[PDB]
Amino acid sequence: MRVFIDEIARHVDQEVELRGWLYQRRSKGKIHFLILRDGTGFLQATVVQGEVPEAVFREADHLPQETALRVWGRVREDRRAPGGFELAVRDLQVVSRPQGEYPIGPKEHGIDFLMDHRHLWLRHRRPFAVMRIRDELERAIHEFFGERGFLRFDAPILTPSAVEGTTELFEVELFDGEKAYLSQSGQLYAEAGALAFAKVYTFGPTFRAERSKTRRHLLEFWMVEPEVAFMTHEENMALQEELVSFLVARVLERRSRELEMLGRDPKALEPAAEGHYPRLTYKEAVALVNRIAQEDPEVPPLPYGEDFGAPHEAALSRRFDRPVFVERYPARIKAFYMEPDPEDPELVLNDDLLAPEGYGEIIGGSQRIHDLELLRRKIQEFGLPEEVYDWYLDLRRFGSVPHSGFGLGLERTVAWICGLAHVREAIPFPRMYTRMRP
Amino acid sequence: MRVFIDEIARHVDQEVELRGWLYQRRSKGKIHFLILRDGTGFLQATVVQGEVPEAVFREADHLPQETALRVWGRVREDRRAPGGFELAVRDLQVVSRPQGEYPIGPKEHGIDFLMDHRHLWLRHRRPFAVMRIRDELERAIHEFFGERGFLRFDAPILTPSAVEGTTELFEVELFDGEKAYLSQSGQLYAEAGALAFAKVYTFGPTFRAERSKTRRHLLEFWMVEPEVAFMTHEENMALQEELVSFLVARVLERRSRELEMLGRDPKALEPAAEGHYPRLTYKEAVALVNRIAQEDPEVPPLPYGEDFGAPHEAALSRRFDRPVFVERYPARIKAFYMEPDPEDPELVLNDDLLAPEGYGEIIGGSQRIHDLELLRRKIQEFGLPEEVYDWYLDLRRFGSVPHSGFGLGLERTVAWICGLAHVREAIPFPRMYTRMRP
Ligand SMILES: NC(=O)C[C@H]([NH3+])C(=O)NS(=O)(=O)OC[C@H]1O[C@@H](n2cnc3c(N)ncnc32)[C@H](O)[C@@H]1O
Ligand SMILES: NC(=O)C[C@H]([NH3+])C(=O)NS(=O)(=O)OC[C@H]1O[C@@H](n2cnc3c(N)ncnc32)[C@H](O)[C@@H]1O
Ligand SMILES: [Mg+2]
Numbered sequence A, B: 001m002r003v004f005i006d007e008i009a010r011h012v013d014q015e016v017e018l019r020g021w022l023y024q025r026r027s028k029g030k031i032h033f034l035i036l037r038d039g040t041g042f043l044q045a046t047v048v049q050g051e052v053p054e055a056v057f058r059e060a061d062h063l064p065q066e067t068a069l070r071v072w073g074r075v076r077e078d079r080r081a082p083g084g085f086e087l088a089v090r091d092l093q094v095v096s097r098p099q100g101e102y103p104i105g106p107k108e109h110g111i112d113f114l115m116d117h118r119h120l121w122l123r124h125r126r127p128f129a130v131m132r133i134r135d136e137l138e139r140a141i142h143e144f145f146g147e148r149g150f151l152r153f154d155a156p157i158l159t160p161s162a163v164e165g166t167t168e169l170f171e172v173e174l175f176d177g178e179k180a181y182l183s184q185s186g187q188l189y190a191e192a193g194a195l196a197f198a199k200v201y202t203f204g205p206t207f208r209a210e211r212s213k214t215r216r217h218l219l220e221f222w223m224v225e226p227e228v229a230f231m232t233h234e235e236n237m238a239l240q241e242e243l244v245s246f247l248v249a250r251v252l253e254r255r256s257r258e259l260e261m262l263g264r265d266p267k268a269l270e271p272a273a274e275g276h277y278p279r280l281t282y283k284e285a286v287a288l289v290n291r292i293a294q295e296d297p298e299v300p301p302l303p304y305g306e307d308f309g310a311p312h313e314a315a316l317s318r319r320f321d322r323p324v325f326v327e328r329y330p331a332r333i334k335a336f337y338m339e340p341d342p343e344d345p346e347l348v349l350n351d352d353l354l355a356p357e358g359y360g361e362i363i364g365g366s367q368r369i370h371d372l373e374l375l376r377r378k379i380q381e382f383g384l385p386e387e388v389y390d391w392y393l394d395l396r397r398f399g400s401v402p403h404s405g406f407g408l409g410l411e412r413t414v415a416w417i418c419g420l421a422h423v424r425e426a427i428p429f430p431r432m433y434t435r436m437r438p
């Protein structure tokens, strides 16, 4: 029967068929050494002369990289093998030979070349591990919220309303000269969903007109955006903590093989899986940065009332063994929808969660304004056209309740967990400022 | 403790708190009749004088529609109640009153008005049932493929490559005058994924520049697009059947309450849940249409070699108690990527699956060309720029294998299962030709 390498362990001492590709080959003496990939793993295959037809054995000398194979043999247990098993080959059929030289040969390549050949690179072990961890998180997100009786609620991609500032917005031409924007966040719609279904979350693509090539920016990425009716600022942070803890615990438990392949230390992720996340006010945070900055001139200082930069977040996150919250920022550097702190009219009830080891923001959230008139002032204070947000105001006119929510950047979470050098490695086909292909 | 109506059954004869909204109210005699919504269901609440403060009882006279409430009471079993239970009210707190009249009052409204107020309409029972069935399918898709060891693989949204014809493509302006297209299908990338991970599927938004307002067209919708290495035309149809069967079985088993609310007969969906889907060649299909057309002048005839229309599909699907396959269409009315039938050079190895009761196409799929030179001819035969598809050609140069896949339109599947009159009712915030708001 045809099996998958993923489950070769439960086919020990049995006749099996594999369908896959030739990853590597060495031919010396009276034995061929093969590594086969099938898409679910990598397995050692040995072709010994006598045990195979001479028509086969001569063919196994002229097999280039990424040759398509069908392979028949018996599975044997062996400690000195990638996985602890091997295939003793008995017969072999070639489905196709490479039409040219395989571009990603046994040489070191620069990231630029690798990303130019991303459609081929995805075959290799490191992307293999990443994509499987991405899959694990995507499944695990659905289970988490399903068990909590949350409803998935797909926010529209085409939108008239801006969410996070007029500065960076893509435009789409429609019919008869009409235009619309590409969603930067589906939050506004998630709120409507919240007042309708109590517990909702979006899980769709989002688009920012970013103009940098930093290790944490893409033009296209995926955002998970929960929203809950009646939920406070405090409850929001607790939920975020519950989520991140579960995700990391799930990766540690089920994807330990993949972590190994990425050379990531599990002991550096266990703390994040166990909750008890530290917590700072913005003020305490700015003060801790200014301490670090005075001891290290590479870390820049931060004047109070100014917005955090990546090095600020980076330095701050290295002080903790797990993600740290930063809360109660000044209203003037935040968003129009954010609820004022009842104690201090300068602050809003928001939070960002920073990933450890220098990674920075993985989540941004807040409590929302529920008072109609307060919202109206905020709109035009931010200089936003009131007309466009009239459906958003309806949510305050009818059935208005306190409510909170956040948005988790999936790529950034993937980069952190896998320990990658850039978010572009965390998605199949990245879209950056200067990278629109393939 | 605060509970949800969704699970009121396991709180019988207990003190509970509800947080929700007033759906309907009638006040006569010495008793108030309430229906409360909380987002997870609808429950009957009774406020009897004496059992409540007089400050509360007088207030329960001036409670408009969609008032925000907190409510304390004991749960009592009662056969004559929506769900089989009620809340005996003891105390009540109002969180907010409507700022104006609630637009969707106890009158009949046209669909145009309802869709203009979609952000409010989502609160009502029929959308409630739809969105919960949509949620059920979205979770169930992930379980199906996860258990089969398939990998979720997110295809890019921004793309240079067209998939289903140059005719209908949106354009996005980027940086420095550059432009890209909105994905109409992520298939091309799913193929790269297939050669890398063997068993993959996308589950993202897709965009067609459709210019009609028919009951099955949107500009924005969600497509599930599996792709498998080594899989034939025959195996493809079997997999599609396996998928649709599971989805419908899952809805029938877990969402029977929601079906009731939509007035959908379960007996009309059971057949689709049990496999054994009928099958036609294109030729046999055209011939059966021409029979129907000759008996009914409302059903139009179909000349052989011409592409099916919605009435053709509609009439055809009514002849079966479950979804029917139509396979082996003429190459000239199909796509560039489709593999030629080895027996007949006029035909390609494709299939469409039609949903019963007049619904029509829910799936479109095929086997793919794996021969490099054959693909090159097809490209420029269709008049497509070879340069743009050079990464697609690489998949034929290196590790090229036979492979097949399909794409399932989620909205159309939702419309069918729920028995809706239009696909716009099957997504939270639809985007049609003349409907871009809210
Ligand atoms: N529903 C909500 O409350 C979300 C909220 N409206 C919002 O969009 N805030 S956020 O932009 O800071 O958060 C977006 C998150 O998404 C990530 N993000 C934000 N921008 C990017 C870019 N350019 N590339 C990759 N990832 C990005 C980052 O992890 C952020 O935490
Ligand atoms: N990966 C693949 O093999 C998919 C393939 N490249 C494809 O796009 N073919 S399809 O357009 O016929 O199928 C798209 C499906 O998606 C649905 N569809 C297709 N177009 C629409 C519109 N405009 N609105 C709503 N739904 C639509 C319909 O159910 C189709 O079966
Ligand atoms: Mg932010």
Ligand SMILES: [Mg+2]
Residues within 6 Å of the ligand: B352, B361, B364
């Ligand atoms: Mg089609």
